[PDB]
């Protein structure tokens, strides 16, 4: 019953400060513009210990499967090759990506009927809010 409250199909309804977060990460102009337009569908499922997050959009489709606490290699939508670790901390999924001596953290939280995603790179935060599809 791990991650029960995250499981489902979610749709992005708002994004704040995402272009600035992507600049802080190092994403180039053309990818920022096309990526920032996307309104993805995030599909979260659990099978035993394995959590899968599948995200579908006009920009990119991605899929990650993982076990909490167990590092995995991820190719992000902006083509970074990162080493990722996802843990549960006080009911928040905390996803750390490491590449080229850099780090970014993505937190996914259940708040009311929404799933709230906070992406942090150094001092820059972006918030992306999802509703049930």
Ligand X SMILES: O=C(O)[C@H]1CCCc2ccc(-c3ccc(Cl)cc3)cc21
Kindly report the number of other CB atoms within 10 A of residue 6's CB atom: 20
Q: Compute the chain's Rg from CA coordinates.
A: 14
Given the complex with ligand X, which of 36 and 68 has the nearer CB atom?
36
Residue 59 lies near ligand X (rule: CB under 6 A): yes
Given the complex with ligand X, which of 1 and 123 has the nearer CB atom?
123
Residue 45 lies near ligand X (rule: CB under 6 A): no
Residue 40 lies near ligand X (rule: CB under 6 A): yes
What sign does the dihedral 110-126-36-79 (CA atoms) show? negative
Residue 93 lies near ligand X (rule: CB under 6 A): no
Return d(Cα 62, Cα 100) in angstroms, integer: 21
Both tokens assigned to 9: 């199909």
Residue 50 CA, chain-centre distance (Å), reads 17
Given the complex with ligand X, which of 46 and 62 has the nearer CB atom?
62
Kindly report the number of other CB atoms within 10 A of residue 90's CB atom: 6
Residue 76 lies near ligand X (rule: CB under 6 A): yes
Residue 130 lies near ligand X (rule: CB under 6 A): no
Given the complex with ligand X, which of 22 and 44 has the nearer CB atom?
22
Which positions touch ligand X (CB under 6 A)? 22, 25, 27, 35, 38, 40, 55, 57, 59-60, 62, 76-78
């Amino acid at each position: 019953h791990m991650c029960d409250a995250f499981v489902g199909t979610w749709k992005l309804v708002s994004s704040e400060n995402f272009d600035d977060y992507m600049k802080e990460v190092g994403v180039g102009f053309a990818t920022r513009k096309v990526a920032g337009m996307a309104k993805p569908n995030m599909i979260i499922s659990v099978n035993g210990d394995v959590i899968t997050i599948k995200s579908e959009s006009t920009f990119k489709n991605t899929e990650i499967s993982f076990i909490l606490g167990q590092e995995f290699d991820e190719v992000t939508a902006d083509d970074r090759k990162v080493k990722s670790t996802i843990t549960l901390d006080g009911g928040v999924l905390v996803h750390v990506q490491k590449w080229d001596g850099k780090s970014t953290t993505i937190k996914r939280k259940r708040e009311d009927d929404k799933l709230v995603v906070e992406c942090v790179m150094k001092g820059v935060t972006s918030t992306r809010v999802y509703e049930r599809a």
